[PDB]
Structure 1
Amino acid sequence: DLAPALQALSPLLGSWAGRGAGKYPTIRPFEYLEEVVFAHVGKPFLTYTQQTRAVADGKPLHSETGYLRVCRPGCVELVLAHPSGITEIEVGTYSVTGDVIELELSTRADGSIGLAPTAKEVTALDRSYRIDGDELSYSLQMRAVGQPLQDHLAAVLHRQR
């Protein structure tokens, strides 16, 4: 069933829901609700989909979809499409410390950003993920629209039954 390469990341599999917040120098701060699904099809990658919506009115905000590849155990390539007209490849590493997994990725570690002609200018994205039992937390830093690399997002999600 599960590819041997994915064994360390098996706790990621399933549905996650929670809430986060974000900011950037060029915008007003915001909050969001988030739903994530990790799945697989028997190969050395997870499938991944995210949908976010406004806490106030449940209006859809951001989504993202793609794949978490294991480039040999310990190595990850996160490959994503964004509905804002942007593609992202983040590269990095993970550690297992008992029930804690830590993933550290960046477009800056031989990753990629692609921009559609009508997209906003994003030039780097960094992601830090922590899975501690039934809790998934992350921060995302962004270099974009004239601003240095800095926080855009962070959230805390919980495993769904």
Structure 2
Amino acid sequence: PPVHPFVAPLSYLLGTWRGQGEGEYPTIPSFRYGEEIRFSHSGKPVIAYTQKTWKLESGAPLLAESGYFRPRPDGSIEVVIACSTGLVEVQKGTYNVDEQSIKLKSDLVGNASKVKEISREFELVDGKLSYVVRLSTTTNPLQPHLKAILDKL
């Protein structure tokens, strides 16, 4: 199906991406992981998102998440994500065509024992997809947790 007019400004996402990331938080040792993301669509004003992570050395599965990105022509966007850990997120924010960036902060984080807010920021950098995930808890303010860079396949 043709790309919906609301999806077209984010058409640079469509496809599959693979790369590597690093995680950290004040309470844990830093770690690395592999990551794969697919963005797809079915002609609606929605982009399907599906992701997985693995251990770099072996390919052993780690986690997975999936959801939907809903951009609008005013530059606003809402993203919903379900995670294999048992969390859900409602993310809201904006996208910027000139910067090829997407900036999101959570309206809600569901079913979490400790996490309070999550922000997710994407940028296309020399054709590669970069992001940063930040998270807070009741006692740790919003701060970096994950960052990755992925090549388009």
TM-score w.r.t. the length of structure 2 is: 0.93
Which ranges of structure 1 fall in alignment gaps of 5 or more residues?
Answer: none
Shift, 1:73, TM fit: 4.0
SS of the residue aligned with 2:43?
coil
Which of 119, 124, 138 does residue 117 from structure 2 map onto? 124
Runs of 4+ in 1 over 6 A off after TM superposition: none
Identity %: 39
Offset from partner CA, 1:17-69 (integer Å, 9 cap, x none): 00010111222110000000000011101000010001122222221100001
How many Å separate the matches in 1 of 2:59 and 2:138?
27
Distance of 1:106 and 1:51 partners within structure 2:
21
Q: How many residues align?
A: 152
Equivalent residue number for residue 21 of structure 2:
20
Alpha-carbon distance change, 140 to 26 in structure 1, aligned in 2, over 3 angstroms: same
Partner of 1:66: 67
CA distance in 2, matches of 1:60, 1:151: 23
Cα deviation for residue 72 of structure 1 reads 3.8
Q: TM-score, normalization: structure 1?
A: 0.89
Tell me what 1:46 maps to.
47
Secondary structure of the equivalent of 2:6? helix
Does the C-alpha gap of structure 1 residues 145 and 82 become closer, same or farther in structure 2, counting only changes over 3 Å? farther
Report how far residue 114 of structure 1 moved. Answer: 0.6
The alpha carbon displacement at 1:91 in A equals 0.3
The DSSP-based 3-state class of the residue aligned with 2:11 is: helix
- Cα distance in 2, alignment partners of residues 144 and 72 from structure 1: 33
Verify: 1:29 aligned to 2:30, yes or no: yes
Q: 1:143 — aligned with what? A: 136
Alpha-carbon shift at residue 133 of structure 1 (Å): 5.1
Read off the aligned partner of 2:56 and give its amino acid letter: V
Is 2:92 the counterpart of 1:91? yes
Q: What SS is found at the alignment partner of 2:12?
A: helix
TM superposition shift of 1:131: 1.6
Distance 1:148 1:136, change over 3 A: same
Residue ranges of structure 2 left out of the alignment (5+ in a row):
none
Query: How far 1:94 sits from its partner (Å)?
Result: 0.9
Counterparts of 2:92 and 2:109 in 1: how far apart (Å)? 12
Counterpart for residue 3 of structure 1? 4
Q: Secondary structure of 1:58's match?
A: coil
In 2, the alpha carbon distance for the partners of 1:60 and 1:146 equals 30
